[PDB]
Structure formats: C-alpha cells, structure tokens
RNA sequence: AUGUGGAACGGGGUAUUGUAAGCAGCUGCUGAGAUUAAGCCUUUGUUCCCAAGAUUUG
RNA sequence: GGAAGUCGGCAAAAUGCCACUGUCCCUAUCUACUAUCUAGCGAAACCACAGCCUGGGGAACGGGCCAGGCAAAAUCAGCGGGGCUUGUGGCAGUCAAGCGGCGACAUUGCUUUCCUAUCAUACCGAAGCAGAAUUCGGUAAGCGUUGGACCCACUAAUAGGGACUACUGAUGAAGUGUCGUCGCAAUGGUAAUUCAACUUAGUACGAGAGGAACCGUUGAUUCAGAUCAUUGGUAUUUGCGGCUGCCUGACAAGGC
C-alpha cells in the first residue's frame, strides 16, 4: 500500500531540515536553546548494560547500532523576534551582530569568489559608529515581540567536509520572558554555544533530515523526514582522546574508526552518539531538536553506562580497533 | 565482555562482529569475518592456510613461549575476589607485558632476517 | 515444606538452586521469588539474585553443595565474576568445560555423593571429585540418563520416579547411604529436580503440589525439627 | 486494546508528567542551563 | 456435572426479534425489478436460507447444552426426575427438535419453489411466506421456551454433587443440629433459623481430613424435600450421619425419630452409619443400637462439643470401608519464620519493592549483596578490557609479587 | 545408508532431515584407533564416528598413536573428524592402510 | 495453547521453517521425522505462509514414526534452527539441522531425553524443555 | 578571480587477495606481491593551473 | 523451506515415495540491448469545433444548456484511467375503536475508494451476570477481517455489500526595483493496529472446582517512515589466487 500522510512524494525543497515546530515556550521555566545542528559523520556500534526492569534483559549486555554525528560549536550571529498576529507569527525585526565571519557570508552568495565580498558592509560599519538603532532594535523585539529566535552558524570550516558554506537557521529561545531571551541572545553575539550546553548524552531528542535520494523508481527518496524518540548515548568531545573509551574499556582511543570514517573523514570536534538510524547519507547535516512535548516512558528516564565502542574498520571487515593493538597482536611487518 | 579468538585465523572476534557456529558434538566454533566462515565451510586444514596464526606457529615464524614477566596470562575458570589495589597493579602488569612482548619479538624477527 | 512458583510457572527446580551453603534465584523477572526465598532463608545462607549465559534457569544449568558450585562454559565472565563477589570463601566456583553444558539436568550432588549423567567426560569427573568433594557414580535413574532433573536428592533423603522398580530404588538408596522414596509431584509431574528443590533443613515444591505429596516429602526429608 | 487516541490513555499520561518523571525533565535542563 | 454452561433462554419475542433482525442486517438489502431473474431468485433464496440456518443454530444449541437425562449418573438424573418431571423436560426438549426439522421443511420447500419465481413480487411473497411459518412454527413453543428457561434458572442453582469423592451425607429430622455439623464441619454458610424447612434443597461442602477431600451434602429433613433427601440417599457412596435429638429440643419425639431412621434404615443399607446422638449435653435407642452399623457417638449439640469428634469417627470408619552428617546452621534451629504481622520478620525485597514504586520500576540493585571488604565500592565498575586483553585472565591476589619478581629480570636484560 | 558419499564429499551437505541416529542422546560418537584399524569397512566408520580415539590406556592405540606411521598432523585431523577436508580424508584412510599393512 | 506455559516472553528473531518443512525429532520419544502444517499466531499477512522459529509451537505430524504417534496432528516445539539468527547480544547463531520436540499442548514433553544441542531461546522459555535437556548453549 | 585555493601524480593509513619472480638448501628471503577509488581517510611530498571569457541584469 | 504459487511441475533445476529447483514465502543483486538525450533523416491514421469537476435538464442525460465548485503562460518524463427496495404466510370464526355492512390490533382453530444493515477491537445498558466464560441490545466504519484441499487449522476476528483531460513526479517566464539568505502558513493530506507476559494473585468472588480487573511495566503481530554498524545475498573492482586450452626453437614472461 504506502502511507497517505507522506505525499505528494516530490523531493524535499530544502537539504537542512527544516523545524516546523519548536517546544511550548513556558515562563515558569528559565532560558535555554532548543535545537542545534549538526552533520552525520556515519553510524557504529556498540555494547550496553540494560537497567531496564522487567525486560528479559535487565541487567545484561545487549549490542546497538549507534549514529555519530560530529557538531562544532554554532556560532549566535543574530537575534529575532516574532510577533503574535492573527495572521500568524510574523518576523518583526532582525539584528546581527558585527563580526560575521566568511563562513556564514558565503551563505549569502552563489559565487563566494567573483562576488566583491560587499555583505554586511553598511551594517557593521553602522553598528560600530552608532549602536543606538542596535539598541532601539533590541528595545523593539523586547516590547513587541513574543518568539525570539537567534540565527545560529556552524563552523563547517572544522569539519572534514569540501563545502565552505556554513549552514544558517533559527533557534528558538524557550525559557525565562522576552527580556531575559534578548538578554541572553544579546550576550551570545560572536560567541560559540557549545552542544554540551545544549544537550546531555542522555535526553531524548527528534531528529529532522532529508533522505538519501535513492532516485526515480514517481520520486523515491530525498524526502523530508523527522524521526522522533531519539536518545543521546554519549556526547563526546573533541579534544579528549578517551571520547571513545569507556569505564570497562580504557584503552585511549577516539571515536573515528580505523582508517577514518568511510566517505566522510575524521572527525575531530564535539560529536552525539545517538541510537539506531538517522535520515540522510553521511555528511548531510541534520538537525536536533528537544521533543516537543514531555513523555516519560521507562525508554526516556533510564540512565546509559555505555561499555565498549567499536572502532574497527568500517570499510571493510575489520578486526581491530586500535594500531596499537593491530601490531600487538601482528607479527612485526617488514616495515 | 569476552574477546574470544576465532577458530580459524587465530584473530580476536570483537563483540558484534562474525558468526556463531554450532557443532552437534556441542561444539561451538566462531568466526570473526565471512572468509574463514566459508574456509571452514569447505574444510581447510588451518595449519595449511598461508595467513593464519596456527600455521604460522607450526612453521616457527613466532616465538614458541612468551613467560613474559614471568607470567603473561591465562583462562582462569576459579574466579577471583574483586580488589582495588589487585585490580591496579594487574591494570599496569598487563600494559607492561605487551611493551616486553613487542620489545622481544622485535629482536625475535631480526633474528629470523638474518 | 513450602507451595511457591516463580511467575506463573510451578517448576522451581528449574528457576533456582538450593543448596546447604547459598542460595541463587533468577533476576529481572519476580522478585516475588527473591522474597520467597529470603523469607525462609534469608538471614542463614546467601540468597544470591543471579543468572547463568543470560538466562532465568539457572537452576537447571548448575550443580552445587554446601562446599564448592559449578557452572557451564557458556557462562559470561561477568555473571561468574557476579557469583564469586556475592558468594562467601568457603565456596568455591568453578567453570566445567564439559560435554553436557546443562549441569542441573545432568548432575544431582550432596555434600557427600552425586549422581551423574554416564555420558560424562573423565577429566568432569576428576574436578567434580576435587571441587565438590564426593564420590562419583555415574549410574542412571528409571532407565534416564537425566539424574539430576529425575532425582531430586539432598542430605536427609531422595525422591525418584514412581516407575522405577523397588529393587532399583534399593539398589540406589544403599549406595547412596540415604532413605529414598518414590514419589510425584505438581500432580503427575515427574520431572523431581524440576519441581522440588531441598537442603538438609528446607525444602520448596511448586503450587500445584498437593498435600499427599507434601506430607511425603515432610516424611522423606523430616522437616518437621 | 486501548489506542493511543483514547482520552483516558492521555489522562494518566497526564498524571505521569506531572510526577518525579517530568521533575527528572525540569532541573535536567537546569544542568545546562548553568553552563 | 457443572450444570452453568447453558446459554440462556430467549422468550419467543427476542428469539423472532434477535433471528429477524440478523437476517435484515447480515444479508444484503436492496434490488431492483430490472434485475435478472437468477439474481433475484438467488438474493431472496440467500434470507430464506439464511434464516432457517440462523433458527435452527439457536435451537441445536439449547438441544446439545442441556444434559441428556438417560446418560447421566442416575443420582442427578433422580434429582431431576423430582425437580423437574424427566417427562415434561423430555416432551419440551423433543417438541424443540420437532421444531428442527419443521424449519427446515419449510425452508427447503419454499427455497425450492422460489426456483421458478418469474417476477419480483412473486418470490417477494413465498419469502414473505417462509418467514410466516417458521415465525409461526417457533411462536407455538411459547410453553416450551418458558419452562426451558426456568428449568435452565434453577439448574445453574444446583451444586455439582460429587459421587467419585469419598462422601459423607447427613441426613434426619429437621432442626435436628445437622446445620450446625455442617457449617462446623464445611466452610459453607448454610441459614440456620427455627423455621422448619430452612434446608430448602441439598447443601454440597468440601472439607480437608487426613490429607483427603470429602465431600458432605446436607440434604432437607423430613414431599418433595423428602423425596430429595430418599434420592440423596438412594445412589451416594456414602456413610450415614443420622443425628438423634437425644434431648428432644428439635421438637419431634425421639421414639419419632427412631422410627424415622428404622424406615430409612432400608435406604441406609450397605452404608457406615452413625448413631449420633445430639444435644447429649442438653427403649428404641436399644433397638437402633442393635443393628451394629450405626456408631453411638454422643453430640453436645447445646454445648457445641463433639463434632470434631463425629467427623474424625466417621473419617475413619469411611476409611476402613474403603557419613551424611547434615550441618544445619545454628541460626535455623533459632529462626523466626517470616510472618507480616510481627515486625520481627525481617523486611524482604518484596517489601523494598512497594515503597520503591512497584513491578517494572524498581530496579533491584544486584551489586548490593556482595561479600566485600567494603560497602563504598559497593557500585564501582571493574574493568574488563585493556589493550586487546581481557582483565579478568589476571586477577590474582599474589600478582604484584610476580611482578616484582619481574623487575630483577629485565633488569638483567638490559644490563 | 550413503555414508561413503558423505565422507568422500566433505561439502555438500545433503540438508539431511532424516532423525536422530535411533534415540542416541550424546552425538559425540567416538570410534576406538585399533578397532578403526581393524576395522574392514572404513567409508561407515568414516562416514558415522565424529572422532577416532587413540587412549593412553590401551596398549595398541598407545602404540599406534607412539607409531612413526601416525604423524602430528595424522592425529590433529583425527581429533575433530567432523571437520576433515577431501585430502584429510584421504590421508587418514591411507595411514590406515599403512597401519594395517605393519600389523599384518 | 499457543504460547501457553512458555514462562516470559520471546524476543523477534528470523523465521527459518515455513509450512510444510521437515525437521529431524530431538527427544528420544521414538520419532524421527516432523511435518509443519500449521503454525500458532500468526496474523493475517496476505501471502505470508507461516514460519517457524527456535522456541516456537507449531502443530506437526510424524512424517517417518511408529503408526502410533502418527495419524494425530498435534503441536511441537521447534528446538533448533539453520537460519542464521541473532541475539540480542549481538552474536549471530546457527545449527547444522532443524530440529524439533514432540510436546502436549500444556508444554510437558512428551520425550524422556533430547538429543544434541538445544537453543538457548527455548531453554529460557520452555522450563519442561529445559528440564529434560541435555546441553544448551 | 591567489589561497590551512584547486588539480595531476606520489607517500602513509585502512582494506581485498593469499605469500610474486629470482636465489639458496618442501623450506627461508615472502602477512609477501598485486589492487586500493573509480561514491575510503589523510598529505609541509613533486609538478602544474587559476588573480577569465560570453550572456542577462535599476 | 522445497509445490505452500498456479485449475497445474507452465519454464528452468536435478542426468547428459525419494531428489532438485526463486513457481512461491519475498524478492535482491549483476550483464548486454531497447529505452532517454544529442547531430541528421523523417511518416500516417485521424480531424464539425473543442477539451476541469458535482448536481439538474421528461429521453440520451451530454462536452456546449442551467446552478455551483472554480480558474494564471510554456513545458519534460511515466501510468494509460477516461421515491422501487428490507422483520414478521394463507383459510375460517369471535370480538369491536369506530365509521358506514365492514371494521384496526388481538383471540381461536391445521399445516483503489465508499456504505453500515458491526465479525473483531473501544465504551455502554440489561440477563440467576458469584468469578471466569457467555447471551441480547445500543453508540461506533478509526481500525483489521488469514493461510491450505463445504471443509481444517491459525487468528482478536476471519462481517455483509456498492462503485484531448485526468493521475503521478520534473522544470519553468512573471509582476511586488533587482538578486539572495532566513522565515511565516492559507489550504490540502495524515497513521498507527492487535495480541499476551510480569506483577496487582491464586488475592476480590467461590463449599469447592476454579478465578478477574484498574494501575504500573515488558515483548510480540500487522502497517507505516527511515537506515546499512553488524550478519546474509549479489560480482564488470573483470580486485587477487587456482585450474583448463593456445604462443614464442628453450626457461621465464605475459597473452587471449
């Protein structure tokens, strides 16, 4: 048959996906991000104790197909404010910031090089001499505005892609009242927001994508998608060589298999080991975002003691995770 | 966690990685990758297969014994009783015994050159 | 003697083991059973919450006594390094590379004689004399090689099938110096092991054990001191 | 079997949010959001 | 014989109301007059059809459910003789079947008919006079259907009498202090009031005696309660439990009462009977005591004393009618058996469960009974990989002194 | 039944559905070295026994097994003669013949 | 009498004997051959023949045995399975031949001793398969 | 449209295969040798190329 | 797994009751060609005029009429679509509301999508419905209604019925100065389904036999959307190795 919620089956008018909806802003609560992006580096697995009472394996060692996903630091370039109309939510206004780095220019242009490398001229010269319709700006939003959504980037420039284009979209600001967002949106201008902020390796989050275009078989494939229920594993950092070891591993390692990650390099920046699969081929950046509404299921509460994670050669059959463990066991080459 | 080492290659099977193989004289037989699942299938003798470590060892191209550090290892099947301080110094006696094992075979293999 | 049942299931020989020193009950699934188990028991022997190569049936894949227990092969590091850190020092634990993994279906052991499967391999049979510190008979129940699941056996007595001829229950109850009766259990179940488990001073049967086999037992096993 | 649209199905879904459940939600962004 | 399987009983109207209306729901509706003449004989063929299979599925039904007198044990089919006039049940149940075929006849004849229907009104009608008749065929039973049900109301009353078991009937004079042994004796509730007659019927009770079940059925004193108690008594392996009033406190004569058990005795046969001898504690007793079988025991029926003593008697006389040095610890010689009430039982895990929020929640912590040194540890996590090697091949006590004794050794290769 | 087949084509298997060699609980068959030698149907022995045993009891299997006939690699294949190769085969069956050619 | 007295609760594992398939007899009952005819819960997937799993009840017919226990289709547990399936622990299983056990509807086995190996998934369900097994891995 | 620029080779890593000729007495040089991106990772390695043309644009 | 597909050994496979086989469960992968696009060459049938849909127009209701829904250029590739009727028989007599002799009921004589008229799942009311199981009835079409020769099982259940344009994807000029980034959301579509396992229990209820539920939790069936870490399959990596045949007077060397 085939679902009837999922058409017209036409290829996704956008590669990031697109949020078409942010969590219920709530007052009572103070301020925090709620969405981040990030690029799938490619997929491993790994071994698990389950603390799941009542499942035929409590207290036992099951095995799980884990995506990684590498996500540099985003950088808060931007602030926004949308305003209540019973025609909708309608952009009132939009500032930047003064230092907007070539990464995110080159979203601006089809041609980075023949360009004349003219954005944002005019406005950070303005922003430099006279901040005061900056401020007035910012005094419009915090007035008028009820949604205020900060334009983030992220740091392609680290990943260990070809693109130089730095991808750009709205994080909404849930938390605390419209001051207290364009407070905090306002103290992020040219600054990074690092994931470990963001996320905490065991929450449950929805991932958005768009599928691997598998072709013409009407269109099949590169469709935009939004998998749910998504749980966090483990939310590595790139600077540590034990983002890939355990408390019943050891064993200094990094996360990037033997011989890089296939089609996609090494990564060597904060990554987020979620569970199963994830929409898109590797490399194609996707979005995360906090579930938009509260459901405890045991799945969503359980804590995660992750006791072995697999670096073996993906491309191919490998069997062993580490060089220096290849050569321990290896008789010395003649090299 | 349990790296078994498979029985055709000799090479340690990681967890989630090859088969499991059931013999009806329960016998149990693992396999790290498909190749030496199919070499077992048609039945080659693993002491006359040019890359496995058992023929390797019965041409002599490794050393016979390593009583490395006067002892190296083996499977115990009379458990222990956990100790933190036992637990330490077998954590550094086993990194100290591969840096012994590698320094000797370096020497091991020049021999063998020459 | 007690009616208990783990789950919904009456056969609790399979879903534990009992012996004069510890006592190991199945995990994750009732801890119903657990409670069981410690309120009878639980301020005299261990009563350790374990499983065997993940697995509720440890009662049927080991053997043990008050002085040494045994495991299969397809035991996990882990869950044996679990058992030796719950269990006490004077027992000791021991992995047996045997033929017959199942060591409940196959071996049915006290403190001073065991019975066991013949089809046994002779170095099983050297470590069972050195760890479990009794005589070795590999002699058969009714004709089934499964002794330890047809012959539920402990200190004080022995309960065989019902179909094996009197001259068979003497012959087994001489040589293992102990009274034997030929008794039922869980109205018709004839799998003993599987459905009664006894030390020298408790014993736990299923629910669906009526009262004519309980007496019995009692009688057998003498509870009643 | 009682369908996920069923009305008394999201009521004590309700009273689960509204227990140490959601609580583990409220202060686990806290963790963050002092960072 | 659990006589509560059978479905209940329709009262003519539902049984028209409930067959009708599943042929207009079940079967289909509309048709037009410019349809061919096979489809429209087919379509009302389908309802004439249909509802003789729908009829006669109801009436197989009752016909299968309700117990066969002549096969049945002749205890509970004397009881229904009583009860229930075999003859009159017999007729109704035969007039049903009777019922049976004469739908299908009907049914068959106007199915066969409606082959040579020519036009719409014409099958119209024979479909219209089949479901007359067999709507008139069943409308005749009315007597039948009625009498059924409260045959059927008053069967799923009666208690499943056990004639296997070892029993024990009771039976004598009204108010003669049998309802007391009964409810001593069976944990069955049975009315005891002055009014006579208060055993209406049979009383059936399971009780528990040298690891046995027995069976006692009261049975009313003495008509057609008599004629229960006479059938009770005629087909039951069982022993006789007469009580006397030997105080004459139940209001009948005890020279009444010895007649009684002398006419009865021929009933009582065969059978291990019991001279009891009630309100002991409140001539022809020679007589009786003459035959033998019956057991002079005497029953306080005012001071409530001796029917222990009756039950355990007649227990009896229905039987007869029918080195391993094991090193239990010091503390089991001295254990308190885990009863909730005490506080003394120590608290189990199923208790720690409760206050820790039940079944699939409570996550039990199994590292929380190791024999350890220390009980910080208590949650740590070992290691079990390093470096290609697994820690557990060597964990041993003695280790760092076989690494000591290493240190020497390399010492001297490389001097 | 077809046993030398069987032993004279290691692959192939035959998807054999057929029962459990006659209520035989332990499949762990195991055929004496001396009766194999003197055995004179050496495809059913071959094709049914999963081991040949040389036991340091017997005299004649110690001797045999202590032969120079039998090599290390005569008595690695015999150990676990459910896995045997066309070759393996072979190689047994003409150590046989050389055993037997000795004895007699 | 489907999944009736299997203890817990089996986890989805690869379907290896659809309908009619024959598997050898494991206990020493007196068997030798078994015929699939039907297999218990299976939903209504069109054109999906029923298959069968380690662990699984399926009504059977002694293709090759004493007249006795023949001419009586009645359910059997399949005990052993050469479809390669896996565990939840990662590893991946399979057995030379598919293998089943003639079993009363209640789960007591009719057998006295099965024969060769036994999956560890019916072990864990079946208690009475797991009483009178041999060696279980 | 001159840069952690891009490309063509090459090296290393990872892999697939199963030990290349020749020499010496089946064995050793030989986990060798070959292939490795065509939809693998990486490159201070060598060389080149680019600081263009046309069109449409208030 | 080996005839469960199909009326069926149709066609291959097995060689030159047993056994083999992708007929099927359930399809997947690989190769060539057509296919598509480009340069060139280049028809004919057919043609009143045209081409959105609902209802109505006495008929034949249609593509034009009427009343509505609506309606934004140019295209590319696929698919060929085009006031009936029901749940209750016939003869005779008796009443008798009443009307003008009939006389009403009653009485006696004999013989893909859609519909709900719901099988299952949700809830509900009644029944001698103790518990369990069940019967009848009501709301209800969200969601399922199977596999093999009337049968024989599974299953929660295997309920009864009607019937050039569009469709599916792909580009696309254009107002709003131009181009671009980030967004808003009118409207359209929509998705989840059933089972049983642990408790709660051998408790409520029952002489006993038997024996539930709410709640919490755990897997499975079916359906949908994704994905390729693992295992499996596929081979033109013609990647490596082995074998067969051929060549240089010879070895090597490759060769096809």
Known sequence: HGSLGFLPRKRASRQRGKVKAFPKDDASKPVHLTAFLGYKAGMTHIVRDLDRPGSKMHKREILEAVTVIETPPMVVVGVVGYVETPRGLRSLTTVWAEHLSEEVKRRFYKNWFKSKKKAFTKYAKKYAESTQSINRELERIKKYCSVVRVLAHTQIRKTPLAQKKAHLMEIQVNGGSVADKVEWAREHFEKTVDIKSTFEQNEMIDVIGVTRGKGNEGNAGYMHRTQLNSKIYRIGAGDDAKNASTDFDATEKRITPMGGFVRYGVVENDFVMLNGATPGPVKRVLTLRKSLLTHTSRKALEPVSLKWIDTASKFGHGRFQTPAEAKQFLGTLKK | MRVHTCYFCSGPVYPGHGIMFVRNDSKVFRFCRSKCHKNFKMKRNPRKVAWTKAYRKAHGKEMVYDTALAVTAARRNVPVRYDRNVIATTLNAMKRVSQVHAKRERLFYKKRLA | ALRAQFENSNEIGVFSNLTNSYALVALGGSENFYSVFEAELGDVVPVVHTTIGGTRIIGRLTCGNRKGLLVPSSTTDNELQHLRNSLPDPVKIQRVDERLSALGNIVACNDYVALVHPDIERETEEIIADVLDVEVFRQTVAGNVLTGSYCALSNQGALVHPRTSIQEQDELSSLLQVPLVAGTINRGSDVIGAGLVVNDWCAFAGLDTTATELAVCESIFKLQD | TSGPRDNNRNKWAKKHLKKGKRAKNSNFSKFLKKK | ?415 | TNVDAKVFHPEKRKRSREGYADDDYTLHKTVLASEFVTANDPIQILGTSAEIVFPKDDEECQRLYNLDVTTEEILLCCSDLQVLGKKEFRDILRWRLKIRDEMG | ?137
């Open chain 5, 1 to 415: 014989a659990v006589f509560k399987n059978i479905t209940p009983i329709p009262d003519v109207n539902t049984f028209l109301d409930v067959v009708l209306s599943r042929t207009q729901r079940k079967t289909p509706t509309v048709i037009r007059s410019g349809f061919k003449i096979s489809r429209i004989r087919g379509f009302y063929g389908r309802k004439v059809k249909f509802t003789q299979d729908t009829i006669t599925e109801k009436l197989d039904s009752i016909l299968q459910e309700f117990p066969k007198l002549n096969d049945i044990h002749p205890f509970h089919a004397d009881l229904l003789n009583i009860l229930y006039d075999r003859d009159h049940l017999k007729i109704a149940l035969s007039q049903l079947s009777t019922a049976k075929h004469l739908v299908e006849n009907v049914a068959r004849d106007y199915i066969r008919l409606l082959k040579y229907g020519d036009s719409l009104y014409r099958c119209k009608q024979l479909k219209r006079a089949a479901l007359g008749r067999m709507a008139t065929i069943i409308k005749r039973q009315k007597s039948s259907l009625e009498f059924l049900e409260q045959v059927r109301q008053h069967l799923s009353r009666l208690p499943a009498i056990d004639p296997n078991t070892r029993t024990l009937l009771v039976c004598g004079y009204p108010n003669v202090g049998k309802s007391s042994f009964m409810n001593k004796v069976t944990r069955a509730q049975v009315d005891v009031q002055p009014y006579a007659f208060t055993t209406k019927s049979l009383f059936v009770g399971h009780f528990d005696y040298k690891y046995l079940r027995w069976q006692v059925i009261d049975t009313p004193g003495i008509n057609t309660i008599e004629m229960q108690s006479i059938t009770a008594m005629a087909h039951l392996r069982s022993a006789v439990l007469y009580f006397m009033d030997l105080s004459e406190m139940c209001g009948y004569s005890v020279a009444a009462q010895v007649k009684l058990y002398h006419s009865i005795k021929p009933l009582f046969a065969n059978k291990v009977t019991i001279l009891v001898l009630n309100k002991i504690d409140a001539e022809l007793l020679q007589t009786i005591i003459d035959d033998g079988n019956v057991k002079v025991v005497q029953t306080s029926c005012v001071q409530d004393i001796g029917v222990m003593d009756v039950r355990t008697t007649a227990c009896e006389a229905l039987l007869a009618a029918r080195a391993r040095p094991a090193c239990i610890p010091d503390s089991v010689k001295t254990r308190r058996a885990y009863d909730a009430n005490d506080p003394n039982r120590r608290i189990l895990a199923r208790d720690i469960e409760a206050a820790n929020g039940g079944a699939g929640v409570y996550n039990v912590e199994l590292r929380d009974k190791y024999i350890l040194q220390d009980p910080s540890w208590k949650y740590d996590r070992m290691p079990e990989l390093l470096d290609g090697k697994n820690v557990a091949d060597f964990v041993d006590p003695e280790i760092e002194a076989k690494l000591l004794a290493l240190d020497e050794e390399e010492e001297r290769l490389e001097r």
């Open chain 7, 1 to 137: 009498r489907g999944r009736g007295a299997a203890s817990g609760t089996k986890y989805r594992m690869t379907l290896g004997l659809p309908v009619q398939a024959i598997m050898n007899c494991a206990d020493n009952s007196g068997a030798k051959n078994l015929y699939i005819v039907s297999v218990f819960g299976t939903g209504a997937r069109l054109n999906r023949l029923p298959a069968a799993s380690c662990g699984d009840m399926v009504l059977a017919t002694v293709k090759k045995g004493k007249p006795d226990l023949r001419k009586k289709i009645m359910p059997a547990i399949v005990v052993r399975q050469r479809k390669a399936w896996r565990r939840k622990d990662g590893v991946y299983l399979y057995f030379e031949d598919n293998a089943g056990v003639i079993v009363n509807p209640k789960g007591e086995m009719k057998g006295s001793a099965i024969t060769g190996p036994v999956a560890k998934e019916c072990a864990d369900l079946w208690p009475r398969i797991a009483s009178n097994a041999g060696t279980v891995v």
